[PDB]
């Protein structure tokens, strides 16, 4: 009666929630055609395996993401002058793509879709802070160095 959920089926549950449901609702319904597999069956082991695999993979991935959040940290000062003119004014346009450009200045590349700064950055030249926000699971520590033209 216990069976691997396989997929998500309303009250039935979601893939991974293998449960002991009544027969018929299973053998004569869910199992036939629908997602199912019977947790009691040896397949349970296959399930455990694939599941643990994926989980560990993704978790370690998020871990290494916090890891490179640290990775890019010791970074050499970002020297991308934003055309500083008339004092604080910066002819250059500062926004997130601006930040990522100041970035690829040796080789490595990123995605402009990860910036973390609610307000747009005042077009200054000071310690432009850039809290890299790759993924929710891991943000980062950074402050690029705006400059004058």
């Amino acid at each position: 009666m216990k069976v691997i959920f396989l997929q998500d089926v309303k009250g039935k549950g979601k893939k991974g929630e293998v449960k002991n449901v009544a027969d018929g609702y299973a053998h004569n319904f869910l199992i036939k055609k629908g997602l199912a597999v019977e947790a009691n069956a040896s397949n349970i082991s296959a399930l455990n395996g694939q599941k643990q695999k994926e989980k560990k993979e993704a978790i370690a991935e998020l871990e290494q993401a916090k890891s490179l959040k640290e990775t890019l940290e010791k970074l050499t000062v970002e020297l991308s002058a934003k055309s500083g003119e008339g004092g604080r004014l910066f002819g250059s346009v500062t926004s997130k793509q601006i930040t990522e450009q100041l970035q690829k200045d040796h080789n490595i590349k990123v995605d402009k879709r990860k910036l973390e700064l609610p307000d747009g950055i005042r077009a200054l030249g000071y310690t432009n802070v850039p809290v890299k926000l790759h993924p929710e699971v891991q943000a980062v520590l950074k402050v690029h160095v705006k400059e004058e033209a």
Binding site: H27, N28, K32, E38
Partner: protein, 58 residues
């Protein structure tokens, strides 16, 4: 009326009423006609509820 997985079939026993009067009767197993495998070929064939209880293939 046989079962193709086990030797279940009708057997004879005696009906006994009050005053223990003996009358010959029969006892039928709980067969069901159901669509299952016998070889890798599928088929519709008899089977008992007890046999089905041990999780056989449909």
């Amino acid at each position: 009326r046989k079962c193709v997985i086990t030797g279940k079939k009708t057997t004879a026993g005696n009906n006994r009423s009050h005053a223990m009067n003996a009358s010959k009767r029969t006892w039928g197993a709980n067969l069901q006609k159901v669509r299952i495998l016998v070889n890798g070929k599928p088929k519709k064939v008899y089977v008992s509820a007890r046999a089905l209880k041990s999780g056989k293939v449909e």
